[PDB]
């Protein structure tokens, strides 16, 4: 109660909406129970999953009697959004996809016989997942592969989103020597998902933990890469928690820090303090007769966890996006010149 941060209402832990007011798609109930119960995702996996379940929910139209397709679908899809809003708070890859999707719903005209609706929403959202995600990531690979010399190391963090393919490309498709160090954190052990895939493909993975973060950097080490959840308007990064400690340790021990991001993921909002806009994530996960049971019913005890916190832009040497490399203080120029306009 001294800082009162545990009563931050940016997430609501209410569950079990039983209301049959709308036709909630059973696939989207599978998607929400797949997100919120056992988190299998990053950010662009959530974006591709949300996008290819909205694919199915527009393919299964079921239009009402007197309402045109241009006058129902945004409210229907917003009530589809509300279940994910209950499940897990949204990324910017959530938001900059759904507002684009609503803008593309808006420019349809009341003459579609609900047969070309597929041909201008399914194909167009496939062009979205092609353009603003996948070939953009292909440009990320082809832009960041020239900035890695042979026989070096890489320190990623958590589950990567795009640069798993970068490490696989520079490991196998370009055959230059590389020694990836993957480090992750309690409780979402999502660096192991990178470690299984990278070592299954046959690259020198050396897993670690973030508590032992000192002895990684005392080896021969350079080129810390970082997956991003969003990049703010100032230059502050925003990603899975525990990123910023190895960011400040990496800048402290004068070895460079990079962020592989794409122009879909830049955000309009602004913050500079870490615990301001943030997600509380289910404090029963930090236990696994257990070690302790019942932080409740014991007065004066609490268990907190944080998913998201900010590296200051002094630490990131280079944000790379599909247009090119850039200093992190110069992200509003791609907020204004390229995001949305491309």
């Amino acid at each position: 109660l001294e800082q009162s941060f545990d009563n931050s209402s940016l997430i609501s832990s209410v569950k079990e909406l039983l209301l049959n007011k709308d036709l909630i798609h059973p696939s989207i109930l599978l998607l929400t129970s797949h997100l919120a119960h056992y988190k299998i995702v990053g950010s662009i996996p959530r974006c591709i999953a949300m996008l290819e379940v909205f694919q199915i929910v527009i393919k299964d139209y079921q239009t009402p009697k007197g309402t045109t397709l241009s006058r129902n679908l945004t409210s229907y899809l917003s009530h589809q959004i509300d279940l994910l809003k209950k499940a897990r708070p949204l990324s910017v890859t959530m938001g900059n996809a759904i507002r684009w999707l609503k803008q593309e719903i808006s420019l349809i005209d009341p003459s579609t016989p609900d047969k070309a609706a597929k041909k201008d929403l399914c194909e167009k959202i496939g062009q979205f997942a092609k353009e603003k995600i996948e070939l953009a990531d292909q440009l990320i690979i082809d832009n960041a592969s020239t900035q890695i010399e042979e026989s070096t190391t890489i320190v990623t963090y958590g589950s990567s989103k795009v640069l798993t393919e970068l490490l696989l490309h520079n490991a196998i498709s370009l055959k230059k020597n590389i020694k990836v160090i993957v480090v992750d954190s309690r409780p979402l052990f999502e660096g192991r998902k990178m470690a299984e895939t990278l070592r299954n493909a046959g690259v020198n993975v050396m897993y670690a933990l973030i508590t032992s973060l000192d002895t990684i950097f005392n080896m021969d080490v350079d080129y810390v890469f970082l997956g991003a959840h969003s990049i703010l308007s100032n230059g502050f990064l925003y990603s899975r928690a525990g990123t910023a400690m190895l960011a400040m340790s990496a800048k402290r021990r004068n070895i460079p820090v990079l962020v592989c991001c794409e122009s879909l993921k830049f955000s309009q909002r602004v913050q500079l303090d870490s615990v301001t806009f943030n997600e509380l994530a289910d404090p029963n996960d930090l236990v696994n007769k257990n070690i302790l049971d019942g932080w409740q019913e014991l007065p004066s005890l609490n268990i907190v966890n944080i998913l998201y916190d900010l590296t200051p832009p002094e630490y990131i040497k280079k944000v790379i996006t599909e247009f090119g490399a850039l200093p992190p203080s110069s992200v509003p120029v791609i907020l204004r010149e390229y995001k949305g306009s491309a």
Binding site: N204, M206, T215, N218, M219
Partner: protein
């Protein structure tokens, strides 16, 4: 309760290590730079035993010279150590009838067969044994076994079916099982007549044998009359549970962590990398216990003693170990490979995954993959080794010679 007795029965696996093992026993081979008797001995001294009985079926003099020059024939060792001389190549089992004819053993004791390497607190195995005593007066033994659930099919020689109880973990039945190279032999049989009053049982393959059996002194007297048994588990634990003697049940324990036993080189490599990595805490290598070494520990799993001469422009990768007094040279490469004491490594060699033992003068430019070199076997210039070679003790090799896969040269 106390006054724990014990018996180690080595020298039954000389079929396995045949290019080696004919000049010094299996039990006297250096797993990590030191001959692996003490990998059993420090364990069962931490178990707190008071006497052991080394069965030495072969090379009995070069057992006892090491034993008298050990730290165990000095008057503060937690057990006194005794040996048993032997005519050559006895099958197991009949050593226990010879023991019963001699009549030394009274009380609970360890039937440690083979040569093990483990981290399990044997103290918490005592209360399982005593709970077996209190809740059953028809007990035989307990059989601790590991839970290697992430890998079947790769515990090489014998795969087994340790079918046992749900609740009490009483070993129901046992059966030998064929190999992944054989697609032919596809059946096992468990006849349900003895399966009457069990009502809950589990059949697993992911339990690796480690031959650490602790029992009561009744069961060698049980084993005395039934003189048909020649193995320890292919015949006995089948032939003691298969309705043969009534009112004699055998139990088996499952641990949760690392406890393993030597089978062959496709297990010797794996246990060498598990021990040399930090997969064997706390029984680890850098503690400098056995023959008062001076191993230090960098990151990336590097083990070096004192007086190591690492030459300039060499690189030493993951999971290696180098003894004292050695000398490597310019352009060499070391990776995932233990190197014995006092050797002389030459120039530009890429040693990888090969277990080079003591006093091995390796010539220049002679790269090595998995070719573990026993003691005093020198090499020469441009001697390209390859996979599977288990080149033996004191083997002179001339220059420019190539080897093949599993060329067991001696």
């Amino acid at each position: 309760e106390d006054r724990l007795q014990a018996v180690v029965l080595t020298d039954s696996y000389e079929t396995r290590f045949m290019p080696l093992t004919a000049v010094k026993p299996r039990c006297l081979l250096p797993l990590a730079n030191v001959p692996l008797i003490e990998y059993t001995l420090e364990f069962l001294a931490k178990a707190g035993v008071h006497e052991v009985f080394l069965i030495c079926s072969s090379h009995a003099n070069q057992i006892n010279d090491y034993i008298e020059n050990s730290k165990w024939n000095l008057p503060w060792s937690p057990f006194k150590i005794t040996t048993i001389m032997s005519p050559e190549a006895r099958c197991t089992g009949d050593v226990m009838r010879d023991l019963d004819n001699r009549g030394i053993i009274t009380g609970d004791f360890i039937l440690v067969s083979g040569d093990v390497l483990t981290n399990i607190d044997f103290s918490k195995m005592l209360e399982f044994h005593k709970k077996m005593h209190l809740q059953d007066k028809d007990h035989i033994s307990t059989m601790c076994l590991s839970k290697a659930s992430t890998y079947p099919k790769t515990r090489t020689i014998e795969p087994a079916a340790f079918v046992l109880d749900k609740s009490t973990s009483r070993c129901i039945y046992y059966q030998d099982l064929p190999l992944p190279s054989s697609r032919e032999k596809t059946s096992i049989q468990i006849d349900p007549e003895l399966l009457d009053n069990v009502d809950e049982f589990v059949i697993r393959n992911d339990l690796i044998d480690c031959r650490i059996d602790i029992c009561t002194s009744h069961v060698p007297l049980i084993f005395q009359e039934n003189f048909d048994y020649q193995s320890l588990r292919t015949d006995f634990v089948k032939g003691v549970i298969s309705s043969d003697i009534l009112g004699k049940h055998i139990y088996a324990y499952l641990t949760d962590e690392y406890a393993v036993r030597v089978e062959s080189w496709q297990t010797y490599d794996t246990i060498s990398q598990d021990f040399l990595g930090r997969w064997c805490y706390p029984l680890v290598l850098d503690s400098n216990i056995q023959d008062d070494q001076t191993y230090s520990y960098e990151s990336r799993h590097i083990y070096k003693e004192k007086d190591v001469v690492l030459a300039q422009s060499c690189k030493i990768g993951k999971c290696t170990a180098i003894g004292s007094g050695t000398k490597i040279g310019e352009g060499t490469k070391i990776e995932n490979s233990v190197i014995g004491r006092n050797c002389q490594i030459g120039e530009n060699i890429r040693i990888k995954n090969s277990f080079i033992w003591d006093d091995c003068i390796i010539g220049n430019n002679s790269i090595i993959d998995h070719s573990l070199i026993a003691s005093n076997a020198t090499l020469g210039s441009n001697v390209r080794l390859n996979d599977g070679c288990i080149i033996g003790f004191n083997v002179k090799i001339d220059d420019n010679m190539d080897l093949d896969r599993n060329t067991k040269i001696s």
